[PDB]
Design a protein around this ligand. Structure first.
Ligand SMILES: *CCC(=O)Nc1ccccc1CN(C(=O)Nc1cccc(C(F)(F)F)c1)C1CCN([C@H](C)CCC)CC1
Length: 363
């Protein structure tokens, strides 16, 4: 019934694939801009603070125990229910039904895209552009839409949607996908089409004018939600560039300082910091190799952890996730003379020992 096989008669490009590019697709439960558990293409699961509650809602909707992770096809099924609801709303709207009824399937997808972005009232404000669309005055409709605040807010997305109205084709999405495929091919592993290998990661860094050991490279990995440091998949690359709204190295270069600025929010730095452990640790290995931990600590805690030099000296004379995570809490709370350290605070033994190690130096 919700089987995607029921849609095999349609085109392979569709509204799901359109919004995957324009809004983005997440296959793991995350919190939206508010606090709320969400998955797929913007599918709200619950307003409950409980992740188990979100997981329960998700399992009911998918029909299996997902533990908070779904496939792209499952995301499409969720999305199709959302689209059907949106379309019913459009058909209830006296300002939108006539133009929707008049449009071909591709242009309907562009209208639905608008409704997902700005809602019915937003789209219904475009009275003259909607009338031009209903009259099939495509070029005038496109000109008028480009004059709007919408165009200023999300120019890349808005241009693609307007092109879809102007042409009744998927050209804007085809062109973007090809542009990214051609860029990806500059970095892909000659021995594995779906990976960027050691030469490719080096080339990517070179093209960005970045040292592979710089914190900037780790920040990009974070934004690309890369799973692991010694692999870089096609899916990660494509999904990352798409999310960042970059179709070239020039554009990605321009985003990097904006990524760095994001880390000024303590919440975002904590996410980055915890990410780093997961990214750094060899898959399978139970904890993070001490030397690797030191290397990454020196990158991410320089200028945040007042005792980083002593921390190096201490460790030079395997790190579990809990210990890694808690060092940032320690760094943040500890006074410059360590006088506020609470040895009954259930810090890792490593940190208890460090505080003992470090007090000749503070004396
Ligand atoms: C793991 C094998 C390896 O070194 N591969 C490699 C080759 C060339 C350049 C970098 C790397 C691995 N690193 C890395 O960040 N990889 C990465 C994976 C996925 C996505 C990205 C992206 F998007 F480009 F940012 C990058 C780096 C790992 C760690 N080293 C040093 C030790 C860091 C100093 C703390 C740097 C290279």
């Amino acid at each position: 019934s919700q089987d995607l096989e029921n849609l095999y008669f349609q085109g392979s490009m569709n509204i799901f694939e359109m919004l995957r590019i324009d809004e983005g697709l997440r296959l793991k439960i995350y919190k939206d801009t508010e606090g709320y558990y969400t998955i797929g293409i913007g599918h709200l699961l619950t307003k409950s603070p409980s992740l188990n509650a979100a997981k329960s809602e998700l399992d009911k909707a998918i029909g299996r125990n997902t533990n908070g992770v779904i496939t792209k096809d499952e995301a499409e099924k969720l999305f199709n229910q959302d689209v059907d609801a949106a379309v019913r709303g459009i058909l209830r709207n006296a300002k939108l039904k006539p133009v929707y009824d008049s449009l071909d399937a591709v242009r309907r997808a562009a209208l639905i895209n608008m409704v997902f972005q700005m809602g019915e009232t937003g789209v219904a404000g475009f009275t003259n552009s909607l009338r031009m669309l209903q009259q099939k005055r495509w070029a005038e409709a496109a000109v008028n839409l480009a004059k709007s605040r919408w165009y200023n807010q999300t120019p890349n997305r808005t241009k693609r949607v307007i092109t879809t109205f102007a042409t009744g084709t998927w050209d804007a999405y085809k062109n973007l996908r090809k542009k990214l495929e051609q860029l990806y091919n500059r970095y892909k592993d000659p021995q594995d089409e779906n990976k960027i290998g050691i030469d490719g990661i080096q080339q990517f860094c070179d093209d960005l004018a970045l040292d592979p050991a710089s914190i900037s490279v780790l920040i990009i990995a974070w934004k690309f939600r890369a799973a692991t440091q010694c692999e870089f998949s096609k899916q990660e690359f494509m999904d990352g560039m798409t999310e960042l709204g970059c179709d070239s190295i020039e554009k990605l270069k321009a985003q990097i300082p904006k990524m760095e600025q994001e880390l000024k929010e303590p919440g975002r730095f904590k996410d980055f910091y915890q990410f780093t452990f997961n990214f750094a640790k060899n898959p399978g290995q139970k904890g993070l190799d001490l030397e690797m931990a030191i290397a990454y600590w020196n990158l991410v805690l320089n200028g945040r952890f007042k005792f980083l030099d002593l921390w190096n000296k201490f460790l030079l004379e395997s790190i579990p996730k809990d210990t890694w995570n808690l060092l940032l809490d320690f760094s943040t709370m500890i006074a410059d003379d360590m006088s506020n350290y609470d040895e009954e605070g259930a810090w890792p033994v490593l940190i208890d020992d460090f505080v003992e190690f470090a007090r000749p130096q503070i004396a």
